[PDB]
Symmetry: C3
Subunit: 114 residues, 3 copies
């Protein structure tokens, strides 16, 4: 899976080991090996949520399968928990786009996963 978070929370407020915590948690939740999980955190963004510049996050999780209603609710609880606990972002100021990628539509190591 690939998880991306953009946030107006400053770089200094992202704790040491945050990317490794995301990776571990996503491995558990998706059932995919940690070795293939990609994570990307973008602090200091110029963003607003509901017209407010209070802390917020705009996120995406791309996965080949493992995407659907119940699974997505679970990822949201996990991911909002993490952002709240670690970045001090209110869960109601977090949007996460979930994408079910087709294996043919993903490149890696000079080809696709088709």
């Amino acid at each position: 899976p690939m998880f991306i978070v953009n946030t107006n929370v400053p770089r200094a407020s992202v704790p040491d080991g945050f990317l490794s915590e995301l990776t571990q948690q996503l491995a558990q939740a998706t059932g995919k090996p940690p070795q293939y999980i990609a994570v990307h955190v973008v602090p200091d963004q110029l963003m607003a949520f509901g017209g407010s510049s209070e802390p917020c996050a705009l996120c995406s999780l791309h996965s080949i399968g493992k995407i659907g209603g119940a699974q997505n609710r679970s990822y949201s609880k996990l991911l909002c928990g993490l952002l709240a606990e670690r970045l001090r972002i209110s869960p109601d100021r977090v949007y996460i786009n979930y994408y079910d990628m087709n294996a043919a539509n993903v490149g890696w190591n000079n080809s696709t996963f088709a």
Copy 2:
């Protein structure tokens, strides 16, 4: 509605009030309360459009419904209008990718909108 603009225009050239103006205008255009709207502007990017590093923008608009031919033409007029007026980017150097999101595939406040 979530609107993201990535641009080579420098941060100093993004006028005060820009994220609020985006929010307000998108609220007006989508028929959604401003409380739901997320906006994100990323200046100072290393980008080229059509072989040139003149001001340009690559944007996305994600919405749960309210995406379609005529609606998208209307958004494009509005958003290119604002980018030109406020960031001095030529409309023919703006791409906006429109995404119709399923409520099940959007996380928020520990759950989804499903």
Copy 3:
């Protein structure tokens, strides 16, 4: 095509003519005029791939119109090739999401391509 690369490689490691090279290579590869091609490179990112902060890249390629397994494999070879040669990123640490956009879902010049 629109090609976006996010990487933990420092900006100083991105060669001077890298945007122009991506543009040219994508034009030559897709048989498409370079005037429509957009390229965006985002260095210095806080990211991890398999829990590791060794050089990696998360990329997307958007086209209007299908890219089959054949085209996608061919793009991946080209693009990972360039990333390895120019940014010294191992191809097994590159992900590329491919998106087939509908013309009506792409805004440009105050309207859409529909």
